Design a protein around this nucleic acid. Structure first.
Ligand code: MG
Length: 580
DNA sequence: GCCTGACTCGC
DNA sequence: GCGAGTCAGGCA
């Protein structure tokens, strides 16, 4: 059953065809500065396996890799591109990425290897990576005969499956979406990840010194009040101290045991002095372990940078994801937490960090897709949307909007932007489910078009089996017809939410592509570093700030044209923090 | 070592 | 709600 291929000990010209399936295998989960364990090429002249030491030292082969006119089909081309970049080799000519094509067709499948993509088209002549490399501590690179057999099979799979995947994409009107958005974005993200973001480790260290000392003062206080020592970080042990020794009221339960969540503890504070200290300890400990120690661990001692990996094929919404480290959840709301952004600094001297973000892009998209007259008018006037929503659902004038009136209208808007349940809204507002439902009806009276959109979208999801975004991204909702309430409700909310959330993802992605083209046209040394959902972060020389202030907002605003304007704020400073 | 749940951050 | 990550406690 062993597939036929040539185990080459040198590169020959028939391997350098102008159309091929290419596999550049990087087995380590984190591909930055990682090894390339083997290469496989499949083309019209046959199947070949090449060793990396041979192939990546061959001037002919490396030229072929870098020749854009030489077309290549791959799975997860960003992985290969970046790993080759740490070796000083460019990858060009990728006209088809099977990971990304599988992702656009159905993100639900969770395709993470060639074998999983292949199964979609009834192709099983390839093994899953987990079956070949193993998993966990047992994860090893197998012997050359096995390795080579596996890579050729993945290449043959890519070679066979290109055509059927492009055909379905074509039928779904997702062919441009792959060739003009997702694949070009791959390249951009590859540069961003390679560039990395410079970190002030000393700053982080002296921060970790401050927390350390504070945690110790707070850890002791907790024991004194507890009258003993326990692991505060153990929900089970804390629950015994709180709810048995101190006899505190049990407000919420967990399948595991007593609930020790901040929202619960917030209400227990009045009963005992130990409660506020525990809250304080957890946030300090959250900050210390997730963002100080976690960050320091992934900083490269050589470059003194952090090189994230963006997962472009994970979410069902279409948003990018970030790992090792996740830079999309760096603390902002609390001042103690915000100061973590001071540690991110420009990669060169006399450079500054530049941040641009969309202002309420999700609500603006909603106005566009729903065509609500009132919501559209509100953004055309560039009103404070939250204050305006408070004016309508409480039937009062701007002078009359109290801070609490605005906080609650904000929560309702938030529930729409993220698709939370009425049960969700009530928990957030610390109010009854019935009142929460009352708020929503009240919002729909003020915003008839959105109500209309919610009704119509759910219906469409039921009729077609999926919902789409502005740029033709697609999400299937099988549980829409489910006869179980909670399951059906989630599916309805995802039907409502994805077109809003997904379309915003679409717009930022097209802006990244447009911005990259303009940066190049303008001959600016400025470069994309990060993407955090609503915002793009850049670094550039201070001499470019004035040009970028004008330039970067313009590109983001003109990415797509909607029925309402798009608004972008920008800032810049000596640190990411300072770009506020 | 391997899972899992419980908890918390930004969006 | 999502997604990422840390920690504990129960497991083979
Ligand atoms: Mg914003």
């Amino acid at each position: 059953a062993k597939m036929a291929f040539t185990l080459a000990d040198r590169v020959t010209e028939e391997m350098l065809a102008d159309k091929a399936a290419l596999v550049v295998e990087v087995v380590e989960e984190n591909y930055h500065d990682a090894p390339i364990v083997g290469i496989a090429v499949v083309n019209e002249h046959g199947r070949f396996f090449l060793r990396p030491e041979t192939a990546l030292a061959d001037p002919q082969f490396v030229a072929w890799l870098g020749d854009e006119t030489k077309k290549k089909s791959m799975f997860d081309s960003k992985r290969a591109a970046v790993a080759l970049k740490w070796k000083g080799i460019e990858l060009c000519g990728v006209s088809f990425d099977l990971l990304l094509a599988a992702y656009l067709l159905d993100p639900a499948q969770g395709v993470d290897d060639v074998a999983a993509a292949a199964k979609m088209k009834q192709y099983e002549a390839v093994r899953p990576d987990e079956a070949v490399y193993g998993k966990g501590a047992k994860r090893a690179v197998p012997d050359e005969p096995v390795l080579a057999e596996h890579l050729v099979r993945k290449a043959a799979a890519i070679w066979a499956l290109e055509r059927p995947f492009l055909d379905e994409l074509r039928r779904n009107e997702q062919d441009r979406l792959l060739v003009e958005l997702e694949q070009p974005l791959s390249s951009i993200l590859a540069e961003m990840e390679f560039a990395g973001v410079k970190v002030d480790t000393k700053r982080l260290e002296q921060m970790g010194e401050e927390l350390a000392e504070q945690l110790r003062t707070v850890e002791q206080r907790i024991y004194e009040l507890a009258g003993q020592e326990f692991n505060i970080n153990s929900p089970k042990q804390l629950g015994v101290i709180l709810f048995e020794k101190l006899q505190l009221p049990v407000l919420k339960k967990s399948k595991t045991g007593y609930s020790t969540s901040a929202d619960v503890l917030e209400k227990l504070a009045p009963y005992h002095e130990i409660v506020e200290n525990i809250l304080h300890y957890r946030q300090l400990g959250k900050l210390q372990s997730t963002y100080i120690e976690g960050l320091l661990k992934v900083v490269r001692p050589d470059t003194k940078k952090v090189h994230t990996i963006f997962n472009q094929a994970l979410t069902q919404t279409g948003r990018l994801s970030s790992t090792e480290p996740n830079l999309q959840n760096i603390p902002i709301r609390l001042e103690e937490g915000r100061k973590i952004r001071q540690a991110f600094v420009p990669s060169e001297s006399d450079w500054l960090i530049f941040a641009a973000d969309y202002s309420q892009i999700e609500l603006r998209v909603l106005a566009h897709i729903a065509e609500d007259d009132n919501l559209m008018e509100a953004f055309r006037r560039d009103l404070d949307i939250h204050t305006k929503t408070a004016m309508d659902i409480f039937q009062v004038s701007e002078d009359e909007v109290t801070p609490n009136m605005r906080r609650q209208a904000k929560a309702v808007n938030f529930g729409i932007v993220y698709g939370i349940s009425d049960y969700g809204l009530a928990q957030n507002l610390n109010i009854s489910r019935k009142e929460a439902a009352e708020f929503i009806e009240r919002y729909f009276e003020s915003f008839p078009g959105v109500k209309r959109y919610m009704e119509n979208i759910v219906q469409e999801a039921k009729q077609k089996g999926y919902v789409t975004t502005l740029l033709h991204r697609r999400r299937y909702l099988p549980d829409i017809t489910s006869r179980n309430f909670n399951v059906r409700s989630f599916a309805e909310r995802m039907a409502m939410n994805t077109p809003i959330q997904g379309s915003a993802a679409d717009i930022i992605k097209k802006a990244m592509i447009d911005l990259n083209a303009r940066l190049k046209e303008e001959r600016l040394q400025a470069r994309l570093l990060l993407q955090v959902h609503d915002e793009l972060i850049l670094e550039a020389p201070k001499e470019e700030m004035e040009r970028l202030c004008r330039l970067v907002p313009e590109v983001m605003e003109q990415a797509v044209t909607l029925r309402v304007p798009l608004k972008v704020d920008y800032h810049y400073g000596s640190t990411w923090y300072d770009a506020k």
